[PDB]
Amino acid sequence: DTRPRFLEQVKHECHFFNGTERVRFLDRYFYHQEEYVRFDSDVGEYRAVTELGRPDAEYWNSQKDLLEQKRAAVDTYCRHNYGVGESFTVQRRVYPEVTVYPAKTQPLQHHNLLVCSVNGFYPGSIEVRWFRNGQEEKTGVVSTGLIQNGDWTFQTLVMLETVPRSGEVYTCQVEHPSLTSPLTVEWRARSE
Amino acid sequence: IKEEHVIIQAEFYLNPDQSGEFMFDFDGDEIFHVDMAKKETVWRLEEFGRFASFEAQGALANIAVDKANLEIMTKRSNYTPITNVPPEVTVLTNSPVELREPNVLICFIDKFTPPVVNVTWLRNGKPVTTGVSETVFLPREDHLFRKFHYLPFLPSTEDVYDCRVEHWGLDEPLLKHWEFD
């Protein structure tokens, strides 16, 4: 199918700061990916983003009850929906699972990548740190960053470049809002 | 200070495919979408529907307004069509692989438009549909789309996997490969 395509998008956005103390509502209209007109609760009326949105901003702003309704959206729509969804979204907590393994089987004294795989957690904000004999490694850390799985869980893989030697204990430490104390998983340096 | 959370009700309508979508997004995850064929709310996790309800029928009136607005903008733009943006495709497991222990392949399709793809899972070159699932098109802040496809599987040294994605911005189907080691 080579027929040209045309796409319309609308995004009704609620941005929440400090719980619901401060809320910003955005009513946004797009053609393909180009926003052409929007209502911003911080502005208080529709504004043309491109020249194609000028007829709609002028028309919608002339409808007084329509404008008052959109100006109240921070309460009737944003705050309401936050309240309804809070228990299973804002307050959703799922534990990370932490697995540690060397990327290759090597004798000691050879370079290697130690992998810290952190899986299944929610929410996304997380801190993963590498330690060698209790000392934090601030160098040689290679991270995928945060990976969204699409099913309300995340994963991240944090690797450490090192040369494992006899006696060393490497520790991956994870801090996460689901946890009351850091979760740690060790790999004691050993051949293969 | 930076925001703590964002809820987006995202809608689209696409011509000439006549495909519409209505969903809610929370911090990048789908709360629910409306099944346009069955006119019903589909919560992304079933438990959500034990805390909330949504009247699916009103979403269809929204999409009709979206369709009407699209036809206006199409004429207003002098029939300027969309530029195809091909997707990036990544295949990952959701958990560290253990041989002969169940796991899940995730096909992450990202940064594309228009929201139309054909996705097939291949095991040793044969299509697989047993237990597969997928999301609808998820909105991006740059107003492209994301999508996820899922394949439960039993890891083994003997099978290889591809996610095959067809998109009008690609010259050929894109295969993204996965195998143990």
Binding site: - | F24, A52, S53, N62, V65, A68, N69
Partner: peptide, 15 residues
């Protein structure tokens, strides 16, 4: 259960 509320898009001016 509580009900999630729907925002409505405005119909653009045609002609």
């Amino acid at each position: 259960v509580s009900k999630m509320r729907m925002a409505t898009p405005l119909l653009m001016q045609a002609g």
